[PDB]
Design a protein around this nucleic acid. Structure first.
Ligand SMILES: Nc1ncnc2c1ncn2[C@@H]1O[C@H](COP(=O)(O)OP(=O)(O)OP(O)(O)=S)[C@@H](O)[C@H]1O
Ligand SMILES: Nc1ncnc2c1ncn2[C@@H]1O[C@H](COP(=O)(O)OP(=O)(O)OP(O)(O)=S)[C@@H](O)[C@H]1O
Ligand SMILES: [Mg+2]
Ligand SMILES: [Mg+2]
Ligand SMILES: [Mg+2]
Ligand SMILES: [Mg+2]
Lengths: 351, 358, 359, 352
DNA sequence: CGAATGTGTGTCTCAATCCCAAC
DNA sequence: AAAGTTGGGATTGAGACACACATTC
């Protein structure tokens, strides 16, 4: 009794307006499907952001369709929740996931599964924006009432939880009811920790989307989760992380002559031909062109070679009492009595 | 400029016979077909702040069948709630401006006079800062050298020091007459106290020179350029464009560094110009991220930008946290998917209808 | 006027270090990124016809790294094959102009003066008639009154009469020199006949010069051209599915639109509706002089400011257009690729533009 | 002893007038065409192009088309399709919408033979060739000609325009077509059926009214698909029954008098579905016609309120000046001929 | 109602810029 | 001979100002 938690594939994302970076997303996604089929898991939980846009290219729809067709043909039930890039924005248009309706269960409610003689409770919903949180809390409280009977229960959400993503969080932590496992998405940091006598997990992205995620790939490989829910409960031990092969990135900040030596030995000691980014001193570029074939592209820069505090700093540099300049600066802009304030200065503290 | 709009109501204004539209904090997107009343909404807001001019003809803004126009506007600035009301019945016009319930101005000219000091921005410089029209995204870039640094002063917040420098001329002159009361009589020990006031008035002028243009305004603007130039590169590089780095002179003229040469905005493509104008305007916002939390209004900025540049621009707007409320008009779908509130506008019988989505 | 472009080569012209581009008859679509090199192709066409101006700095148009610029252009007009070659080596410039193979002009100013004789259009009105740049599709309609009818005459083929009106000034003033040649000058008196013979003839020539004038026959012929244009203007404007009774065109070619409960002008319309009128008017003018001025037309990103729907409907318009032999269009939009006849793809490898034409 | 279905020009996704109702009318008629096809149980379905309206159709149109041909494939109906002009990818790396139907439909770009009830029938077809690459198309047709002589039953699927049928935009002539037992064609929405080269050439009309110039054909010959019986050794028109689907009704009115106003109401009431009115109506008649904006879908009707060479001489003579001089001088100056040699003749000979 | 207003428009100017030909 | 030097030409930007148009007291 094992399942796969995968999310944030962002199929169709064409990084750097470059064809190769668009295909690199497809391959890793195809490779994720390949590894999943090699494992033959009982259930696949896709927790959102399969596509990058609401109207993805025809190729990305074919690639995803023929992928989820294979999973359904091998008697793997796939559950999905709509992501933020998949919720229809206008009236008559449909989500891209509607093409996968006959191979994947799009979760907006409850469902129970029989796995070798045991009832496991699956529930999930689409991406709720921060405005409609009160409707979300009612959907989560309903999923709580329908769950007290089942000792094994999982929750699929495509949201941001407060203690994990502070920038754009749509839910707080204490609103989440008790579940054995949390299949979450919308943040591309691979996260795995305990939460309310269970395991909260962000499967993370599949390919490096935004540039802040190669620092992760060298530390934390990208891919999906393989969870072993055979025993009655869940721990960190029975969760194996599956790493996929991504496009290598090489970061250089060449402002010195020692920063050219770091390149070749790193560009070759990686899997595939990488992408270089950062800053390269102008004097180093022409002697750097020798290996632009062993690299994909070079998005590197060619480099040549608090007012209230600063106003006082300026006045003293000219030789004038800055505290006077500032307090006067407030007296007239706030339209206060500069008359009452100027008459004092001439008497006491003048020379 | 802690500027933020709340709501507006409009009667018989161009295509909008009657419409009340609610604004929200965040990326507000107004979508519709061409001629569906999108740009017409912002002509109404501009009408509320500044009365009809010769350029703002009533016959131009009256609904071609009707004979009157009414519009009220709610908004906040620096914490206060304001309410502007303008009307034109059958030949005569009136205006009311409320501040937190009770009225503040009751005549048209009184409202216009009140608006320009609460905003610190006049009619003409309001179009180069807050309300950017169609294609005029790069107009702020190509302004006259004097006009360029003139609108930059408002964009950076330095213009408030000029308000002291002119009010100092009122202050310096008045302390000079307290000296004329001794000087205009000292002709035709305690003599040291005569010199105490003389050295004191001389002090004020050098303080007036601090607030002056060449004094601290230029000094603070000169210290502001590297920061804007850093943010300008941060946002311009998001367009994956093939250029080394964008240099910003102290005169706010932009230079783009190519590998085998240096280009200016004149040579850049129509789309690359917009790529610079937006990223610079955001660099100014990101520079004073907490100093000047201003709201921004854009009318079709993604025009002249290709499929990818329209897309990248959306992801730029989503990561922008420096502007509390930016309202954008577009006929393109690349910005529907990134907005928080989407205001749909369609037209029935030459009459526009508003449908707000939360 | 049977003007059609053929092919153009260019060296070190801005982003194009080297590019050879052939044109075909029909709906030619130029696609590419922003800054890929689409507009630069027509900056070169303008460079070959008219030399660099003071605002058209060489430093503006040379590849910022390179030091030379070469552009050769092939084209047809009223049936003859022409070829222009303009270069600038390292400080020196030259220009060549061939006609059906053999050369016609060899100096820059000789070529410049010659091009203006075959097109009948100078620098100023070639950008308002044949090569319409960004946004200026509708600028011609909101233009200044004198400037509006000044450019209306060129796309109507009326400017051919203004050339007569000014070249008639040559004859009237030179036949007056033939009087001063006579005035200063048992045999006498057969010259009293010449006083009435030539003076009444000069008064006749000036009386004929007023016929070729603007307010004489140009305005008259323009009046007889409006009713046809107004009907075509509405036939093409109704394809935009816009909510208006009918589009009225004044004698002065300023447009009034009939709403049910009012009448609006271009001042009131939205940006996209201006472009809708502008393209429908230029197509109405083209449909009018189907044989008088069967000229080619070039548009730089016209579907800008148009929504998704108007872009599509405008594409179905261009397909039904048979009056214009060759209309080259540039777009960053996909709404026009599917309707074009030939798709010239323009990509850029860093800072150099490379063209991949598909026939 | 076999039957097949010839259908074309469905234009899924066509959003006429940017109107939701007109967008669904294309889906419904297509669904109903699939519904009728399922009722018939045909052996093969020949779709000859323009299934979708665009290269990037809406997801809804993709779902509707997919679920239709999945129904056809699961019922052991082999569906053959050729890409239309609205479906040929314009750029390189991007794919056509028809690629989603690869597991239910055979996209034809070559030959194929089928055994149906004990007889071999030759099917061949190719995608839409633009008018430029006609010689490549002709090279494909001569290849399809050599590979077919063995078969007494043969069919050709094309999405082109043939000269004797559309003079405006045709891409091939009639003599370029080799002899086939049946021609399953498309891209013109007028339904055409006639004899051709000892065979039957057929244009399956559109399924819904797409361009407004096609209601002229809809009322004469209804829109839908063909049902062909290839039981006999050859083919005639007798064994071809056209199956018509119901489309959105359109009502044309020219209400400028009250005699033309009864023509409206009595027709708007005596039609099937909520119709679409268009044309011109006098403004003094429009508001009393607006009473029926509930019994109609949409109203696309207009509100109505209430060469130089001859004219130059006519103008010059009207001003009192020899136009023959004005004209002949007008030609003399436009060319670089001698105006002096032409004027000195007038001043000497034909002056007063 | 007529004057006080900014707002735009047309047009005119000195001045600069830079291409083009010439010595 | 070769190289800059130089004035003829065209267009452009900024700076002035009467002439309108329309709002507004
Ligand atoms: N006085 C008026 N009475 C009635 N309608 C008017 C009047 N003035 C303008 N309009 C109409 O108002 C519409 C203009 O609205 P806009 O907001 O400019 O259109 P839009 O949707 O914004 O397109 P954009 O954004 O400008 S490209 C046009 O359809 C005009 O015909
Ligand atoms: N002198 C020059 N040397 C080198 N590159 C240049 C020069 N002048 C311009 N460029 C670049 O050449 C490119 C050509 O862009 P454009 O000529 O505008 O063509 P385009 O962008 O494809 O078409 P549009 O209509 O402008 S979007 C731009 O990226 C410019 O930055
Ligand atoms: Mg997400
Ligand atoms: Mg995501
Ligand atoms: Mg077709
Ligand atoms: Mg068709």
């Amino acid at each position: 009794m094992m399942f796969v938690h995968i999310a944030d594939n962002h199929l169709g994302y064409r990084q750097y307006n470059l064809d190769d970076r668009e295909k690199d997303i497809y391959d890793s996604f195809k490779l994720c499907i390949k590894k999943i089929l090699e494992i033959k898991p009982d259930v696949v939980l896709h927790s959102g952001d399969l596509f990058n846009d609401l109207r993805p290219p025809v190729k990305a729809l074919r690639i995803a369709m023929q992928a989820f067709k294979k999973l359904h043909e091998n008697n793997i039930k796939v559950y999905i929740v709509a992501g933020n890039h998949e919720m229809p924005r206008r009236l008559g248009e449909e989500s891209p996931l509607a093409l996968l309706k006959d191979y994947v269960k799009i979760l907006d409610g409850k469902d129970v599964i029989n796995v070798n003689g045991e009832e496991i409770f699956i529930c999930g919903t689409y991406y709720h924006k921060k405005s409609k949180r009160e409707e979300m809390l009612d959907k989560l409280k309903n999923f709580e009432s329908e769950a007290k009977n089942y000792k094994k229960k999982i929750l699929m959400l495509h949201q941001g939880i407060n203690p994990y993503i502070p920038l754009d969080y749509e839910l707080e932590h204490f609103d989440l009811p008790k579940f054995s496992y949390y299949a979450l998405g919308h943040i591309h940091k691979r996260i795995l920790e305990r939460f309310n006598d269970g395991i909260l997990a962000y499967s993370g992205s599949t390919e490096i989307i935004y540039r802040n995620e190669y620092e992760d790939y060298k530390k934390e490989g990208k891919g999906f989760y393989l969870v072993d829910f055979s025993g009655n409960d869940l721990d960190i031990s029975d969760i194996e992380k599956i790493d996929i092969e991504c496009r290598e990135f090489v970061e250089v900040n060449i402002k010195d002559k020692k920063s050219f030596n770091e390149a070749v030995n790193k560009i070759e000691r990686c899997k595939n031909k990488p992408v270089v980014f950062g800053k390269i001193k102008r004097e180093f570029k022409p002697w750097f062109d020798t290996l632009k074939d062993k690299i994909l592209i070079n998005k590197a820069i060619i480099v040549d070679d608090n007012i209230k505090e600063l106003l006082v700093d300026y006045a003293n540099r000219q030789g004038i009492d800055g505290d006077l300049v500032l307090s006067l600066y407030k007296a007239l802009l706030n339209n206060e009595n500069w008359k009452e304030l100027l008459d004092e200065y001439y008497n006491t503290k003048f020379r | 400029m802690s500027m933020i709009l709340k709501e507006i109501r409009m009667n018989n204004f161009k295509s909008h016979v009657n419409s009340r539209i609610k604004f929200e904090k965040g990326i507000v997107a107004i979508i519709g077909e061409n001629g569906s009343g999108k740009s017409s909404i912002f002509e109404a807001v501009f009408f509320a702040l500044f009365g009809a001019g010769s350029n703002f003809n009533y016959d131009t803004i009256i609904t071609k069948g009707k004979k009157s126009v009414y519009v009220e506007l709610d908004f906040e600035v620096n914490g206060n709630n304001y309410k502007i009301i303008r009307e034109y019945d059958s030949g005569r016009g009136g205006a009311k401006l409320y501040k937190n319930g009770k009225p503040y101005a009751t005549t048209i000219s009184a409202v216009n006079k009140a608006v320009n000091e609460i905003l610190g921005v006049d009619r003409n410089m309001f179009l180069n800062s807050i309300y950017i029209k169609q294609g005029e995204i790069a107009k702020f870039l190509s302004l006259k050298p004097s006009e360029k640094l003139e609108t930059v002063a408002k964009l950076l917040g330095i213009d408030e020091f000029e308000k002291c420098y002119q009010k100092m001329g009122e202050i310096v002159k008045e302390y000079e007459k307290r000296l004329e009361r001794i000087e205009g009589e000292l002709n035709y020990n305690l003599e040291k106290e005569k010199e105490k006031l003389t050295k004191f008035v001389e002090y004020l002028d050098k303080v007036r020179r601090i607030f002056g243009r060449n004094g601290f305004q230029a000094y603070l603007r000169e210290k502001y350029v590297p920061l804007i130039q850093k943010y300008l590169n941060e946002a311009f590089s998001e367009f994956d464009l093939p250029y080394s780095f964008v240099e910003l002179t102290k005169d706010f003229e932009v230079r783009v560094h190519a590998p085998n040469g240096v280009l200016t905005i004149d040579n850049l493509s129509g789309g690359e110009q917009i790529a610079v104008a937006l990223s610079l305007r955001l660099a100014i916002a990101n520079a004073l991220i907490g100093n000047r939390v201003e709201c921004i209004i854009l009318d079709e900025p993604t025009v002249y930008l290709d499929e990818n540049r329209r897309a990248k621009l959306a992801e730029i707007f989503r990561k922008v946290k420096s502007i509390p409320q930016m309202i954008i008009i577009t006929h393109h779908r690349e910005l529907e998917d990134v907005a928080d509130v989407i205001i749909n506008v369609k037209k029935d019988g030459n009459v526009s209808k508003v449908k707000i989505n939360g």
